[PDB]
Design a protein around this nucleic acid. Sequence first.
RNA 1: AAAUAUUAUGAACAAUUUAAAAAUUAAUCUGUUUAACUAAAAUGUUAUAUAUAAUAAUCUAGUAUUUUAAUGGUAUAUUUUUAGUAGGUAAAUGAAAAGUAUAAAUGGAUAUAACUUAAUAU
Lengths: 57, 181, 52, 98, 138, 175, 29, 52, 244, 193, 139, 73, 184, 40
Amino acid sequence: ERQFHLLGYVKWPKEIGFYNAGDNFELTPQAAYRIYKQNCDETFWTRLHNEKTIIHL
Amino acid sequence: ANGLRCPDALITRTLNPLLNGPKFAVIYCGNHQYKVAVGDVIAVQRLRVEIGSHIALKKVLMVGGPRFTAIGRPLLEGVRVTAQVEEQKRMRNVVSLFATPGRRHVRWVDAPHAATIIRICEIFYSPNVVGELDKYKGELLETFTPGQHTNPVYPVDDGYDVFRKKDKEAMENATTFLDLL
Amino acid sequence: QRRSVQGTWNPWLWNYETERRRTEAPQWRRKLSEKEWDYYVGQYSAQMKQEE
Amino acid sequence: RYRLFHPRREAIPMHMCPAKTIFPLINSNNLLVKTRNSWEDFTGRKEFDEDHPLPVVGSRLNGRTTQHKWNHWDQYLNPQITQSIKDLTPTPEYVGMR
Amino acid sequence: RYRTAWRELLHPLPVRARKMEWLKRDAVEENEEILRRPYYTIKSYALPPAVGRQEIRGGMHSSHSLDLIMRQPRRVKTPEQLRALRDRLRFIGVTGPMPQATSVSTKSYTDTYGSRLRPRYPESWDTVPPHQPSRELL
Amino acid sequence: HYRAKLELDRIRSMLRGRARLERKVGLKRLFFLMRTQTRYRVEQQAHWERAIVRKNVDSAAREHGTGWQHLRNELGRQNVMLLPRSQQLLAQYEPLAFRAVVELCASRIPPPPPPVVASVPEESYTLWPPASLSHPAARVELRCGVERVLRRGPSGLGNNVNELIDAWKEFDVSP
Amino acid sequence: VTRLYTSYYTGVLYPNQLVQPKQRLPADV
Amino acid sequence: VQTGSPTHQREYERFHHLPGDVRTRPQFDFTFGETRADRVMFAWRKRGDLQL
Amino acid sequence: NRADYRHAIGVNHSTAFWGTGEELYDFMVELLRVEDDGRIPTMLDLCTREQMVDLLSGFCGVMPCGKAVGDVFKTITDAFLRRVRNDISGPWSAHDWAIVERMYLVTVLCDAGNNEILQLLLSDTASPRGPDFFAAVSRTKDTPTKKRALCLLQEAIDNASAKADKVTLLGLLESGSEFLLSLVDKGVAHTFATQNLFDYRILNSFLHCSLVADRLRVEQSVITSLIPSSLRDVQVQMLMSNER
Amino acid sequence: APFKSVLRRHKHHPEGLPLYNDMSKQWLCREGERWWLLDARGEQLPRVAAVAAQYITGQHRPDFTPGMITGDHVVIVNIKDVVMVGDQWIRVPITWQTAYPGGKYRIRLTDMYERDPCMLMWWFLKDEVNRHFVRKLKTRIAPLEKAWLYEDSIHPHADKNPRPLCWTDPEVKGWKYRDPQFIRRWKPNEFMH
Amino acid sequence: GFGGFGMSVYTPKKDRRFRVQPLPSLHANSLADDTPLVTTTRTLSPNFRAFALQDGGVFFTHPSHEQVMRVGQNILAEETKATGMTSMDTYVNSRIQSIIAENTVENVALSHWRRRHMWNLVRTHGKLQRHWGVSDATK
Amino acid sequence: PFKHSWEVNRMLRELRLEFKGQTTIVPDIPQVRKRIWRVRHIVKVDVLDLDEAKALIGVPEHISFTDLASQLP
Amino acid sequence: YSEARSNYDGTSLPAWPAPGKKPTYPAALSELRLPQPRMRKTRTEWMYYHGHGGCPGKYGPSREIADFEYADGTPASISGRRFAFKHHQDHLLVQLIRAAATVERYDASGLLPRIPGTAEQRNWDPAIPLFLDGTMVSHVCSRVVDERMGTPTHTPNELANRHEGETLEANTMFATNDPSAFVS
Amino acid sequence: DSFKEHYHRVHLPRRLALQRYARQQSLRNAAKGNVKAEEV
RNA sequence: AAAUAUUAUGAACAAUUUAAAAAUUAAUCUGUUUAACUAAAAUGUUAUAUAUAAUAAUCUAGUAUUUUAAUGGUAUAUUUUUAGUAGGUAAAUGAAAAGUAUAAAUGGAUAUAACUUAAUAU
Ligand SMILES: [Mg+2]
Ligand SMILES: [Mg+2]
Ligand SMILES: [Mg+2]
Ligand SMILES: [Mg+2]
Ligand SMILES: [Mg+2]
């Protein structure tokens, strides 16, 4: 837990994302769609962001 | 003699039958604290009372039973703990031998610890309750309901602690009953 | 004499009693409500914007 | 900790020894003083009630006492109790052999 | 910081002992602060005694009732009331004669029972009377 | 030089071998034993005994989720005044009472207020006589004493205070 | 060494503290 | 001052009550392997022309 | 410790650590645990109820702690329970009742009293209980259970005395002696023993204790008159007797 | 007077040394015993040894008496996954000497783990026990037998049903925690109403 | 360290008393004047109810010893109902039942009755087979 | 007190402090102030004004301390 | 019966608040004048707070309340140690009264100065502002104690040689008026 | 007995018990009516 | 404070000083034993191994990365600031009404050199 909080990662609820069997941070498709709906028109959003949202869906 | 008194008839009728039965008393006497019951015999330091005399103990720190416990801070009021003085005698002698290895002088000090042996005849308790008291909030509850727990508890399992040592599920998810019903 | 009015301590008296909470704790595997969804996605997007 | 930071007023609490212990009538306009001047002027234990006398449980100073031998004042006051040669003791200034 | 790194290795006391020594220093400083106060303090008859006080807050202290008495207003408002209350103050064990202004038939306890005689006091754990009234005379 | 020979010669039965057979060896043995036991009782036994009691009470509190440290500090705060021996006796013979004490310590129940300084009543500042009645402060103190009499224990004197105060009138002879 | 008697000093045991009985009238008179 | 076994208390920790380099862990340790002929267990860092 | 101790110098090299019955016992418990894997107990289907009781007793005796393994105990008890539930409707006899009673005794011995068998034996009337029932009941602390077992023992003793079956009468007397010792009310225990004449029958059962048995039966009244009421302060009692 | 005989049970005697779990003495009790299951995965070896010795010696019971040897059994599993902070696996020694000159062994925790990983746990439990019961031999030896060390999760103590032992490490300090700044929420009546 | 350079050293006897276990520290919870240091919240805490007394004391109402033992027994049954009760489970259950229903003290070993009745479990096939009430009057 | 020089012990004797853990009550005169200043590393001092002491003990405000001192023997 | 008094008169503050109101809690921190370090009160400090001076069995109800009484209400007798404790309480009260009377007579006679502290304290402590405009062996002992404890340090003779009677004057060119420089 | 002597005295019976518990899994098969040797 | 008895327990250099060794290669010296019982009781030896540091690359000197504990902040708790009982008091000069005999069957006057004497036992 000390190393986790030192690197600076956050414990999100399971509805958002979680560390899967390979300890990779997998993001929920619902969470990805909501992140898209919020950050549609931001400056950093890109074609690759839309592609990854479709990938998660 | 063991009548509980409270301005709320509901809490009075709820807590009155819980004072029945035998009781124990943690009592202060002779700069020592004893845990006396309705029949036991204790050796206290020497009191100036003749044998065969009935005496009441004043300093009462705690009065409890199979169903209740009155924690006096520091002392309780309204407790009648009557005992009878059976004996007054010297306990087993303790011998102190003071002998400095240098000089030639030895001192033999006998100490028979004088003590009064008393048998507790009766223990009665009649408290005066003010009202239901909240433990976690810390306030005095104006209403009293025996059917509902005043301070409920919840299991320590939020799913965030990965390395939390898990006990068995039956002990981790276990609700208590309602004793005041 | 050693006597006990309530009963002597035995190894199985408080054995099956465990630690509890004084208040309800949010579960990790918890169905988020709409306000929780909004708040948490906003926090995630805020840290994402800072990083970007 | 042994370095305690509390008001030393608490080291001698007067909650149980107010001024009324010395002047029982101080709440009125009277100043009758009633003190225990020392520990020496203690006349001894006294029974509160006739029904509850004090026990006869001797002390060392009270029990470890030899029998009385007639002294010079007793023999001078009553010469009838001078019955043996052991009564004719020397001057009381004489302690004994070295 | 070579001098500091070397000084860190030089310590006669452990951390707890150093903390206790610093608490002792704070106690000495408190004594000095208390001694730096004036000898007296000019007050008024009407105002409460706890008005010109020079002074871990919000909690109750052991001197709560004393502070309440010090904060409540004084009960003797004027020197006229002070003297009108003090003139009726009477001393019993005082050496000297006492007047008979009000009543004549009323006799004193000493006038009735002499000076060597005392009333039989109830002697118990709660009532401890002044034994040996002859030891009190110097 | 006193060596308690006549007193220690009676306890040669508790020794064994040459100390029990021969007198000088047994006297030396018993003298050493009594001296060392006196030393231990004076300056070493209490430490061990109170450590045992402290460990038992700490284990009892750890069975409930606290420790000796917090339990002792909170007992001091709540002003319960239970010696460690009584705490051990409750932990071993009255577990429900010990758990009730732990619950009292853990709860946010306000500890009793500090003792109150004895206050002087307002009747003490009354000009008496105001120009055969009692002083007002003395009458207040008599009423307080009567109430304190009647509060302690049920008695046949009665719960009323006015009729108990007016007892000299009962003893009085009407002229 | 002189004694200031600042701390609590337990009294001493002296023969003047003997519990003296009460003179009782005879049962006949 | 020796208070424990070499597992819990190291040999150089005996002089911890003294100020200086004995409160630091040495640079060299000869306890493992072939025992020194003069039985030198530890050696601290050279302070100029002096080595402890 | 010739079997549990062994040193590397060469002591107990030939007497220590024998695998005498380890493999045999493991195979015998696997033959019962395989029933849970196959869902059909072939061994416990070939076994008879009496044979099942004997098998459970054999396991609880083979185990050095006196208690069989938990899984084996539970398996045997469940199979016995289902067989008794199935066969108690058809032909049933006092021998089957005695088998059930000794099975309950084996359960109490192996330290898991079967409350179902206990309630069955306590409720089913028209059959006197044998000595195993009272021996097993003497272990519990339940006052109502023991108060019911006292009436059951009285009925069984009356039935044995009416049938004039000395063997079962003496067995009931031994089991009831243990039961009365286990009882907490010395008054009712002594009254039951006296009114059922335990001493006389138990002594007559012995080899040469007949001229003393009938003598005790004759002199029982004087002995009871001489027995004191309280066995406390015996010295004070006999000193008061000396004063009288 | 008591008498401890000189003719004692020896390690070289055919009768051999006993097992205190099987002995029948006045100061041994197996009635109120309980079986705990300790998992040494990701936990430090001295901490695990201390926690296990607390339950083994019986100090965790409010009726603990130093003369009475009454302790619960603890099955410690996953010894191979115990941790040791830093390079202490290489730097912490285990030393013991024989009755011969020059017969002094100084090994490492690495060597002890390579030979038998359970010997490390046994050594640390021995230290934790001798911390309080070093005077006599029965108080030294009888507790140690109540420890069941298994480098894997496989153990034959399934009939005992060992309850998982949960202990909290006393070091939970964050050493500071400043509260974050949040937007203040206002009430309508707060603005002079 | 209290050693020093000039002061001579001595070998102090190691303190072998039984020490209390350390406790976790909570800075803000300890500095707050409304929160105690002890933090115990367990299953029967809602059962342990508090009341105020006129004399300043606290009156605690709790379930009895038998009720606490019965709650523990119910928890044990809830635990062992899934995979069955082992030998230790059945022993603990019987022991809890005996503690609940004993109302007296037990001074004899628990295994003595079994060691005495082991003849009911072990069978002898020979001419000398012990049964209940075996005597020459029976044979 | 005996762990220090004889002069500090004399000052503490003047303050009527003989052993560790003893408590005394003294006036606020310059002599007492000088003594307390000299032993300010061995004692803990608390201050109570005259009105504060009159409130601490049960004495009215129209009754001073000089008359009580003249009354006490 | 049972007796429970924390006061001589038996009176006390309301132990319980009104129903539904937040209670009052004592100060948990040790009464140290500095804001830091903050330390929870020890058990001895809590005893001092609740009125038992230091340890139990001293200056509290556990010692003031009678140890026992007869079943018919008859109280116990006066022990010698009880009389000694009463004399000790009277001695404390007499100390207080005599100290207060000494202060009052000093103030009436005008022996209380207007400058706080003694001359040694003023020469030592800079936080004090500047205020401008029979036998004799025991007496000699007091004089030598004063001579030894008056001036702990001397001004170096390089500045003002005291053997010639040279003394330095107060140089307050860099002084300050606010006490915060010494308080903080 | 020394440290290692005591350790081995306590654990060799336990090692043999562990080996017996291991062979219990092999005997599980023989009780099923199907005997298969250990397959390495 | 007197009148009386005894007094041999034994230090060389240096530094400083009409004020402090404050020069640690310096000590400034009389040790040490001292305890009625039962309780109470406030005390301290832990380690932190990287910031003028550590881990790394380019090129003829620049730079990259690291998780830098604060020095009164960080608690509570762990063995010497207290009572009750005993119990004259503030520590070193023998006890005996039984031969000191009118007392003559149940008087324990019982005196208590650990080493130079004599016998005995091992
Ligand atoms: Mg002691
Ligand atoms: Mg002279
Ligand atoms: Mg004495
Ligand atoms: Mg000789
Ligand atoms: Mg000789």
